[model samples]
Target: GLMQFTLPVRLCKEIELFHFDIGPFENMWPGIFVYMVHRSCGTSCFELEKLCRFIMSVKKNYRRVPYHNWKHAVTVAHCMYAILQNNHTLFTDLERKGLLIACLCHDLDHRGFSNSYLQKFDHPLAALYSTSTMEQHHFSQTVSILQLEGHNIFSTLSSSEYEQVLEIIRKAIIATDLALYFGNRKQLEEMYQTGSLNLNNQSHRDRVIGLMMTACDLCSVTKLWPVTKLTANDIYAEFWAEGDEMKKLGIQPIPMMDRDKKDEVPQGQLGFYNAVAIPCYTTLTQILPPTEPLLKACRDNLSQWEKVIRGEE
Candidate 1:
């Protein structure tokens, strides 16, 4: 009976026709993503329809944050899907599936606050995980949602396969922590220099997958100017909301979080590109040449940010 559902031919065409840039179709993400996963992993029609329902359930779990919500989740997933299409040979089927799902669920129930905020305010999630509180919660929430009936799209997997996918999902979700990205970047660099970054090696593969998760999470950093700026504004709105709440509690907010410093977005984003986003995408492109476009987009956005800084834009 689940086979009664099919991807809209037009939507499927739009998905197939596009390159990396899937514009703002927030409402269509679940359907498009279900089509993507089905196309990639060879799911039965029954499983496919069930997976669609599962994705929608997972979507409902996300909070209405300015940035970190269902729309962001789907954008990250779409980025991963695009990257996977371009570099399918870089990872196994299991890893690809794990990466996509991790991207989709990485920020489940985000509360418009950072991990540091949780720790500073003594939130329960902070008590639960001393480090990476939000990321750990995201992974935990993902697992809990998967446990629900008619969910668990990986139910078709063998025990070992399911476990493997789950393990990758855990690691991949936690790896979205920007704090972890620096260490991963350094390790990747060392491996690149030493020629030890073999994709077939489990250690290397794990690190690469983690880095890939970071890349997908920050996918907007490399998007075209209009999309990149829109996403950046949304993120800053989230930060400002958190800061507004912090102020209400008589706590000082970080510069990025402060609404008064909203004008600093351009400069702050420039610094972010130079210090973080550019370096991450550069390393990724070095490792996987097929990902060179991400580097190019990063540079493109970087140049635009520079122009804005110079009052040229």
Candidate 2:
């Protein structure tokens, strides 16, 4: 019993140590990590609290925002910084801050479903957006509030730095959409084939951040086993919650949460990890080995989850 119980604590302790000791948050991002970047970029604590308030306001006034919320935004921020740190040489200062802000604000008030669902519902934002970056809209709206209204976030920055910050933020934030994953992967693969680690030009920053953000967005597998399992369970729960909401609206639920019991959850996740997460992150670890432990954790989680699926746990 002691061994069984101590196992989880030890795993969690290792995970925490990895994040704290192995990864230095200060140097993680070139411009805006929680440690070094915060000196120049912006305070995540301030921005996150503002975001929470913004979400509450949307809930009270708009009654319907996207499903992406503060937790998802923070998670992305944390993971993106980790990825950026893991590949520290890939970015410049300005590029780093831009990516940092973008990740933090990417999904300010997400409505819990994909853009495909938005178009189906004929949501007004969808009508105006035309494009399928639902999460992007969440990011843009927050920036718009700051830019147009001098709201909570950008009020702290100088007038000279304001517009530049906005541009960087926009580029970084909108790039988080999973719908854009393939195009991004294609870019990274091309860069890899060319063997060019050129992070010199401004365009390079954009491309690098695009590649980095996607890497970070899917960086869950790089976490320790306990964290990975928790993450998987959380993802499963989020999908189910979204599916529940969709059912209420008379929409077809996502296959993962198919109440019909016809959908295959484990198969979907296995396919997702094998086809998408693994190729992307494994390639990342090849470039940055500090992430190897995280990958090992993912492997362990996958095994554990499989056992749980088979009623072993």
Best by lDDT: 1
| C-alpha-based local distance difference test score of model 2 | 0.57
Tens digits of per-residue lDDT for model 2, 1-313: 1111122344335323223222324222222223333433334423544433443443332213222444445455666655555556655555556565676667666656667667777788887788745755766666655543323554555676667777777766666676676676667667766887455657755655665566666666556556565666666665777677778789887687664653466667677877777666665565556666545655665676577668676
Clashes of each: 0, 9
As for candidate 1, its clashing pairs are none
Q: Rate the local accuracy (lDDT) of all candidates.
A: 0.82, 0.57
Query: Candidate 1: where are CA atoms >4 Å away?
Result: 1-25
Q: Which one wins on TM-score? A: 1
Candidate 1 has its poorest 10 consecutive residues by lDDT at: 14-23
What is candidate 1's lDDT per residue for 1-313, written digit by digit as tens? 3333255665556454312445576676776777677666555532765677778888899988889989888888887877787786667888777887899899999988999778878899898899989999999999998898888788878999999999999999989999999999999989998988888789888898888888888888877688888788899988888898788778999888898988788898888999899889888888878888778888888999899989897
Candidate 2 matches the true fold with a TM-score of 0.71
Model 2 regions lying over 4 Å from their true place: 1-67, 86-90, 148-161, 244-254, 286-294, 309-311
